[PDB]
Amino acid sequence: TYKYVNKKEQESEVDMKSATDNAARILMWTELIRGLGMTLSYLFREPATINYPFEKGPLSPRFRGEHALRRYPSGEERCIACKLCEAICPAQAITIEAEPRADGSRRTTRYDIDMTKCIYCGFCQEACPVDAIVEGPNFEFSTETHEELLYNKEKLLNNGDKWEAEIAANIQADYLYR
């Protein structure tokens, strides 16, 4: 179906009352007074402004911000160098080099992420079959230097050791929806 927005106008019938009403509208600026009234109403409303950085904007567990490599509760690393994360990373931001750890386990030596290439898409944490790489909630990690934004294994491991209390709970919340 369809409707008209500016064809409503029908044949012209005009009286003295209609003419006088249009004249008052044209001479006393009726329609503009109404915009003035709207802006006035907004002045006496509560502003939606939050007091950052004290009170902050809402978020959800699914928020995908800063990356971190997690561990099993034993302290062992979850990554096994399967390389799905870098195989799908559509920005080619991940870089991995694996090697048999002295104990024989399959682990990484290099795990680098150019956070100037990451598009923060989440494909790596939905590809990881061991829930090792995640995209944490932290977004307040700006820097004064480009180099600081080229994370390696130690940086991501430290982030994981810093946010686990939050990452784990957000996972526990969201992992049934996946």
């Binding site: 002045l43 006496f44 509560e46 502003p47």
Partner: protein
């Protein structure tokens, strides 16, 4: 809320009141507790020069009454 605006309005109101009160009080202080005489036409200026002259000191606002005619 909207009442967070009254500080600036009050400041600017004080600042806009100051000029007139200042001008009035200064005119009174400088013209002998009187409003500064207005000279819109030459007659008023003539009157003021007359007053200036008759006043012992050349100042138009030193009014000389009946104490100075005998």
């Amino acid at each position: 809320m909207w009442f967070e605006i009254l500080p600036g309005l009050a400041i600017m109101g004080v600042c806009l009141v100051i000029p007139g009160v200042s001008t009035a009080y200064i005119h009174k202080f400088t013209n002998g507790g009187k409003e500064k005489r207005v000279a819109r036409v030459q007659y008023q200026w003539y009157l003021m020069e007359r007053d200036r002259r008759i006043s012992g000191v050349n100042r138009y606002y030193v009014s000389k009454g009946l104490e100075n005619i005998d």
